[PDB]
Ligand binder design. Structure first.
Ligand SMILES: Cc1ncnc2nc[nH]c12
Ligand SMILES: Cc1ncnc2nc[nH]c12
Lengths: 339, 339
DNA sequence: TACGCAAACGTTTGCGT
DNA sequence: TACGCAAACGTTTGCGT
């Protein structure tokens, strides 16, 4: 029941009970035992609430995610979770779905619940959001998904999604392609706009022109893939290859080509991005840019912890790097031999 | 800063401050305002810890999951999360990975953190686990994944995974198949053993015999799929159709057939189970048993809430039902016309 | 040597008048 | 009418002797 109850059974003071429970000071064996014994019949469970209340910290972190079912997301999340656990923390998962309201919502409940730090992955960042965010500069936090350091009041991990974008395009070019298309993810997010612009650089470098009929915005969702691909192959002249903003949307596009009896890579080449755990088992095996999701996990937790325990004041940023993963969805384009 | 600070700026008592903050009693407008005003410069945030401490409840639920990246899982989880939010709760996500230790681990931190209730999805349930579980009968909890009511000390939601198993087999039979195989998920879990036995019933009913060379245990993971399928098609005589324990493993098997240049459904028919969000976009579009994941979410939260607020004492169980979803991975078998 | 007193952390709420 | 006193919730920890 309560510490009081334990001391009494133990015939010792709560001060004692508490010290033997946190080994915060020496306690006689005979003493220690008894308390243990007491603890064990009474079936005592120390109240962290009580405790947080005195010590001023909850040993609990809050992840304000965008959605958590998405392959990408899920994957990072599981990581972060692995980190909180090994280091004694507790995860409070919370998805805002990109709903400002839902965002002020969670944010507040968190503060109130007095989470030691805050992990942030909101995908898009409008001023209004960035604004709410500042209001909480007091809480240690890191934004795991910016392309640049959006603000001064936080830690940041940076994925170099542009470098990724560029890598994807190059491979395409280097494989013999010149008629390429793209189904970008929303321009309102980094992994969206950033990857696209990375891709667009390489093209310019190649004096390659992407006809706008060949550009089709996705939402990271497989249906979006499906429809984009559809819309691309559903036209007179079609690219010989396509760079797809994320693997799930990629998967999306794979199904629509199969449905038009288009052959991949034989008829259309396909490059994705993220390298989700199931990508290898796409059909065919997906060729994609791999986003280090597990470090993006770890590096964020870490930065936070630092700030948390090392009472760090200054905002810091850590870069991370994507890297090409070669599979079976891409094939040589018409200009390979001429390179 | 603190309630004290607010009352002082407000020139009113904390009792007052608190009442205007929870509208727990009438407060003069002029009064109310001021407090609000105070609250707002001081930038006050009520401490839920403090609060839980007095009121005896955290308005926070704990989900002791198995893993959270898995499609299936992820999907339910997102649901549960949607429920805690709309009803004011807070989710504590925690994966045990089927590690007893990790399981005593989380379980304890939870109690300590004094979560109002406990959602449980541990996949396998050995005595040792069931044992730890009992120790916490005090905390309201429901096990979202049993096939039957494993114990008396909990709420239970039941999926009728056997009924699902049976439905899968029937379709197979009804479509003209008699040489069928199966890549079951681990017998140590419900969704494993249960679905398999459901499938096995129908076969007996059909006087169908499954050669053990045609049975191959998976782990719900795509590689397992891959290898199982591989091992099945890699033999003299092969089934004309296969019932796969879960969609991700199914996806697993799709990739290996493609790799052996086997045609699906043209060469091999494929039935999955779960109906994950991406299943439709498998290639081809997956035919599977759909597990209501979103209700399994909702119904669990609800039961808990009940127990929670309605201080319910008796363990209750709620059934849920799977239902065939027809796609493109199955085709008529050799005996269709003869039926 | 080994242990206890009592004050505090930030709230909520029964009784008041 | 409208508001305040003070005790409590379950711990931790500075000073003790
Ligand atoms: C915002 C977002 N959503 C889903 N998958 C993604 N991959 C990269 N960014 C993503
Ligand atoms: C235990 C388990 N893991 C992953 N996917 C599943 N589908 C049903 N049960 C599953």
């Amino acid at each position: 029941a309560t510490i009081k109850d334990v001391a009494k059974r133990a015939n010792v003071s709560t001060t004692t009970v508490s010290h033997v429970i946190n080994k915060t000071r020496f306690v006689a064996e005979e003493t220690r035992n008894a308390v243990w014994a007491a603890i064990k019949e009474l079936h005592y469970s120390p109240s962290a609430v009580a405790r947080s209340l005195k010590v001023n910290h909850t040993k609990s972190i809050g992840l304000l995610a965008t959605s958590s079912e998405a392959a990408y997301f899920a994957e990072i999340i599981e990581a972060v979770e692995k980190n909180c656990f090994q280091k004694g923390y507790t995860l409070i998962l919370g998805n805002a779905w990109n709903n400002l309201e839902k965002q002020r919502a969670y944010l507040s409940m968190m503060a109130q619940k007095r989470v030691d730090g805050l992990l942030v992955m909101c995908s898009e960042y409008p001023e209004p959001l960035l604004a709410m965010l500042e209001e909480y500069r007091h809480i240690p936090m890191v934004v795991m998904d910016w392309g640049e350091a959006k603000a001064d009041f936080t830690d940041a991990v940076i994925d170099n999604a542009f470098e990724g974008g560029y890598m994807a395009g190059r491979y395409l070019i280097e494989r013999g392609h010149r008629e390429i298309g793209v189904i970008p993810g929303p321009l309102e997010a980094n992994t969206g706009a950033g990857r696209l612009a990375g891709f667009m650089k390489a093209m310019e470098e190649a004096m390659i022109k992407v006809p706008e009929s060949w550009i089709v915005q996705g939402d990271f969702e497989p249906e979006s893939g499906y429809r984009a691909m559809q819309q691309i192959l559903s036209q007179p002249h079609r690219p010989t290859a396509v760079f797809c903003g994320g693997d799930i949307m990629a998967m999306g596009a794979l199904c629509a080509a199969d449905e038009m009896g288009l052959r991949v890579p034989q008829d259309v080449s396909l490059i994705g991005y993220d390298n989700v755990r199931n990508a290898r088992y796409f059909t065919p095996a997906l060729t994609t840019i791999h986003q280090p999701k597990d470090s993006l996990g770890e590096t964020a937790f870490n930065m936070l912890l630092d700030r948390i325990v090392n009472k760090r004041e200054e905002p810091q940023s850590i870069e991370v790097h994507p890297r090409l993963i070669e599979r079976r969805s891409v094939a040589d384009g018409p200009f390979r031999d001429y390179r």
